[PDB]
Design a protein around this ligand. Structure first.
Ligand SMILES: Nc1nc2c(ncn2[C@@H]2O[C@H](COP(=O)(O)OP(=O)(O)OP(=O)(O)O)[C@@H](O)[C@H]2O)c(=O)[nH]1
Ligand SMILES: Nc1nc2c(ncn2[C@@H]2O[C@H](COP(=O)(O)OP(=O)(O)OP(=O)(O)O)[C@@H](O)[C@H]2O)c(=O)[nH]1
Ligand SMILES: [Ca+2]
Ligand SMILES: [Mg+2]
Ligand SMILES: [Mg+2]
Lengths: 440, 420, 67
């Protein structure tokens, strides 16, 4: 059992979803038609990969996933693409008209017309689960659907499935690939309305991914395809513990216990290594020590910020491939004597470690070298609040003039929702400050 | 998805027809409405502007309106004249004689209902109408008076749809018709309240470009319209081809219009070529289609569209370079206010081009120039009997002027505003 | 101790139900308030437009009653 339902909302959520499911198929030996010849239990089972895939009597392995967008063109590519047979048509849901980069349209005007249908489809997936663990929700901060429809959905999910866990993968905006001036508004509105409905949220800063693609993959001008293939490897690392067995595997829930000291402080920093091209990986094997030490290089983080100028509340290392504890412990010992790792005085300083033995996979035509071992660090650091500070400042600059606010007011929103959202973010920045102060 | 196109009056129909010629060529649609192109990118968003009829014929979603019949004959005989739906031609007999009140209150009111019947029939069969684009001039009577009436009536029936205009602003350098500044002021009063987005295509600027830059000693309507059609192709590229940025009229409005009244854009085009050169030229005063110096104001928002095969790295770097070296001209309180799209398909006869759409507080210079010409006549009540004879009061002129002066002050307010 | 055990689990049930309830009522209040605001925005726009149609009638009359 232990089923997890993935929900992909808007363009960013959908396209990241495509990259993740493609990768999961390759990792588990599932073909594009859904067949998995290695699975000898036809039509069911309680294998570790069944947390993410259900099975039909005809041997098809079907993602436990709903894709939702308010216009049809991105989801139409899934319907006509390589993995079209993977998904039942009812899992792929589209409207006719998008949210036009406006939270208010995604949450209210357009989103309201489709929310009951989406919950209906999610319910069909939930009814097939014998021990549903919870939801994984993929979306942008900046789009109208990724912001506004996601908030509406998260609120409705708390109503319909109570405290059942909900995790996010949230794409934080960057100017090199952003498509709207109002993204800071949409990011603050959704963060505010979703904060009480999410147990844990993994922010992915497009600018950090964009820079990693340029600096480490030698990609001159990264596209969404480049960014998403890398994002999917990080997602896969995080979810690998739910999808594979092994004696040193540590479930995501157990990392969560350590990552979330108070409900609002639920935003881990992910750092992934190694991100290396094929031309550089050839005849240069990276060891456990090298990949682990790369987790403390800010340039490998998924969110731009500087952990050397905040405090740690937890550090978790999620390894995959050819990795034994002895080498992990020796790498950690070395790092502690050399680096700026300062914990708050109320948390213990031990790193929590999981190892899944199944090695990393790459997608054909990809940019990443295939490697024997990789690691994703999940740290709870006060430094992640910097990402909130940058976004809050941009919000203030515009909001002091009410720039663009009439677009939201014209869809039925009030100014009071803006300032309520902004004050919740001010209090969040303040929470992150208070947790790093010493105990008296 | 679908856009409904309306062209009104002589100017509107002439620039309208050229728009359809230029985009039908870019999409591989010939004058019979048959597709004979080489690339699936041409057909992927074809339904934005064209209906499909029987026999894989593509028919512009286009309505052709005038109070003067005969503009209908000249369009119908033009190179692409057979492509338009015959029932979408709606023409009166009278003319409007360069009188806005005839277009808006008397002659145009008589004809407006039959135009709406055609609008509704086109709209009814749209899968998901996004809105409307109107091509017209502001200096005559039909495009100006009747065009702004149509806008108001359309808005009543489709209040949640986007209304976009390509509005040709008058200049003494191109028409000597003396009442043009009245007709333009009265129109601007309408546009300020009832459009979401207006491309100010200024006959002053088109003339100055043909004369100074292109070295044409006596520019014709054909030479002015060559600039208008390249601009219109450019500013609708994002609507017509697959792409990320400003892909529909509402998303463009949301990116470009920070306050609802300040929705008058300065278009530009280059060339009139390396990526650094396109980029410098597209931001040059001499390449703007509104006679305004952008260095006399500040940019609220900008869309830059590059077309052709070029390095996206170089485009990003140059866009960043212009913003950095010209930072004082972009308002600091709208972060990241310049957006860039690159489309692989160049326009006809160029390897590379750039189209510029600016929401600049310098547009106030256009309105002030019209305002000056308006007042010079209005202070002596000159030529007013043409308008009072159709039932209008002086008070309506006073209000229109005052509202356009308010628009000017508002553009000035945001220019002077500071972050701190 | 058995009675304390029963109070802990009822307190948990009560807090979960209360969370669901408050989230259900908040959402319903927001969606109502948003509907009314949007409709009031559209109704004001239509009302300005009807005032224009009314004024256009006063213009055609002024012209009729001029002659
Ligand atoms: N990493 C990544 N980011 C994306 C992708 N697509 C869009 N984004 C980012 O997401 C934000 C834009 O929101 P989208 O997801 O496109 O919009 P949407 O959710 O479809 O919302 P509407 O289109 O307004 O209804 C910007 O910050 C984009 O850079 C993607 O495939 N990958
Ligand atoms: N750029 C450009 N301007 C034009 C063209 N035709 C007319 N104009 C301008 O439009 C204004 C005159 O309006 P017209 O469109 O000719 O008048 P109308 O809308 O047909 O109205 P009436 O003739 O009064 O019924 C003047 O400023 C002209 O310079 C054209 O093809 N291109
Ligand atoms: Ca099985
Ligand atoms: Mg979208
Ligand atoms: Mg005429």
């Amino acid at each position: 059992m232990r089923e997890c339902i993935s929900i992909h909302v808007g363009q960013a959520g959908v396209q990241i979803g495509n990259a993740c499911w493609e990768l999961y198929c390759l990792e588990h030996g599932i073909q594009p038609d859904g067949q998995m010849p290695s699975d000898k239990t036809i039509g069911g089972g309680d294998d570790s990969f069944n947390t993410f895939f259900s099975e039909t009597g005809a041997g098809k392995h079907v993602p436990r996933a709903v894709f939702v967008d308010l216009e049809p063109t991105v989801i139409d590519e899934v319907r006509t693409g390589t993995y079209r047979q993977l998904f039942h048509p009812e899992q792929l849901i589209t409207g006719k008209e998008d949210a036009a980069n406006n939270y208010a349209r995604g949450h209210y005007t357009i989103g309201k017309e489709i929310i009951d249908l989406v919950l209906d489809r999610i319910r069909k997936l939930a009814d097939q689960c014998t021990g549903l663990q919870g939801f994984l929700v993929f979306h942008s901060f900046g789009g109208g659907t990724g912001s506004g429809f996601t908030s509406l959905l998260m609120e409705r999910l708390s109503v319909d499935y109570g405290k059942k866990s909900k995790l996010e993968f949230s794409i934080y905006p960057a100017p090199q690939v952003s498509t709207a001036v109002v993204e800071p508004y949409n990011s603050i509105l959704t963060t505010h309305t979703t904060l009480e409905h999410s147990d844990c949220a993994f922010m992915v800063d497009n600018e950090a991914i964009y820079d990693i693609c340029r600096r480490n993959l030698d990609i001159e001008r990264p596209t969404y395809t480049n960014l998403n293939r890398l994002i999917s490897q990080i997602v896969s690392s995080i979810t690998a513990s739910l999808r594979f067995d092994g004696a040193l595997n540590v479930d995501l829930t157990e990392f969560q216990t350590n990552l979330v000291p108070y409900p609002r402080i639920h935003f881990p920093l992910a750092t992934y290594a190694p991100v290396i091209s094929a031309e550089k990986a050839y005849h240069e094997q990276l060891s456990v020590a090298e990949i682990t030490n790369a987790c403390f290089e800010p340039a490998n983080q998924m969110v731009k910020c500087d952990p050397r100028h905040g405090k740690y509340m937890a550090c978790c290392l999620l390894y995959r491939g050819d990795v034994v504890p002895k080498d992990v412990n020796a790498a950690i010992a070395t790092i502690k004597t050399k680096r700026s790792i300062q914990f708050v005085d109320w948390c213990p300083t031990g790193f929590k470690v999981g190892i899944n033995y199944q090695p990393p996979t790459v997608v054909p035509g990809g940019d990443l070298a295939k490697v024997q071992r990789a690691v994703c660090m999940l740290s709870n650091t006060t430094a992640i609040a910097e990402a909130w500070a940058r976004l809050d400042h941009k919000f203030d600059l515009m909001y002091a003039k009410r720039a663009f606010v009439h677009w939201y007011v014209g869809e039925g929103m009030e100014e009071g929702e803006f300032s309520e959202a902004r004050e919740d973010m001010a209090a969040l920045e303040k929470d992150y400050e208070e947790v790093g102060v010493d105990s008296v | 998805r679908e856009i409904v196109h309306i062209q009104a009056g002589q100017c509107g129909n002439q620039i309208g027809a050229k728009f359809w010629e230029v985009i039908s060529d870019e999409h591989g649609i010939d004058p019979t409405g048959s597709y004979h192109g080489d690339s699936d990118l041409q057909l992927e968003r074809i339904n934005v502007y064209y209906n499909e009829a029987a026999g894989n014929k593509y028919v512009p979603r286009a309505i052709l309106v005038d109070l003067e019949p005969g503009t209908m004959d000249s369009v119908r005989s033009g190179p692409f004249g057979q492509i338009f739906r015959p029932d979408n031609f709606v023409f009166g007999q009278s003319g409007a004689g360069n009188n806005w009140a005839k277009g808006h209150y008397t002659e145009g009111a008589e004809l407006v209902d039959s135009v709406l019947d055609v609008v509704r029939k086109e709209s009814e069969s749209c899968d998901c109408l996004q809105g409307f684009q109107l091509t017209h001039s502001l200096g005559g009577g039909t495009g100006s008076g009747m065009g702004t009436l149509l806008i108001s009536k359309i808005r009543e029936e489709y209040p949640d749809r986007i209304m976009n205009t390509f509005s040709v602003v008058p200049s003494p350098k191109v028409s000597d018709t003396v009442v043009e500044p009245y007709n333009a002021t009265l129109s601007v009063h309408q546009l300020v309240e009832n459009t979401d987005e207006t491309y100010c295509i200024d006959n002053e600027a088109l003339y100055d470009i043909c004369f100074r830059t292109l070295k044409l000693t006596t520019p014709t309507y054909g030479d002015l319209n060559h600039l208008v059609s390249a601009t219109m192709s450019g500013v609708t590229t994002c609507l017509r081809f697959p792409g990320q940025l400003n892909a529909d009229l509402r998303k463009l409005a949301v990116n470009m219009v920070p306050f609802p009244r300040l929705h008058f854009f300065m278009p530009g085009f280059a060339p009139l070529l390396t990526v650094p050169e396109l980029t410098q030229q597209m931001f040059d005063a001499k390449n703007m289609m509104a006679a305004c110096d952008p260095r006399h104001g500040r940019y609220l928002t900008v869309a830059a569209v590059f077309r052709g095969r070029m390095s996206m790295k170089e485009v990003d770097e140059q866009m960043l370079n212009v913003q950095n070296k010209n930072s004082s001209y972009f308002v600091e309180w709208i972060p990241n206010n310049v957006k860039t799209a690159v489309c692989d398909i160049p326009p006809r006869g160029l390897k590379m081009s750039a189209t510029f759409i600016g929401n600049s507080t310098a547009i106030q210079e256009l309105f002030k120039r019209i305002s000056e010409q308006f007042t010079a006549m209005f202070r002596r009540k000159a030529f007013l009997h043409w308008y009072t004879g159709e039932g209008m009061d002086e008070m309506e002129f006073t209000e229109a002027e005052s509202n356009m002066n308010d628009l000017v002050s508002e553009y000035q307010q945001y220019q002077d505003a500071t972050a701190d | 101790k058995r009675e304390h055990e029963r109070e802990v689990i009822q307190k948990a049930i009560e807090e979960n139900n209360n969370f669901i309830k408050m989230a259900k009522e908040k959402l319903a209040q927001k969606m109502e308030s948003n509907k009314e605001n949007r409709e009031a925005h559209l109704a004001a726009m239509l009302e300005r437009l009807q005032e224009k149609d009314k004024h256009a009638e006063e213009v055609r009359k002024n012209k009729e009653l001029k002659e």
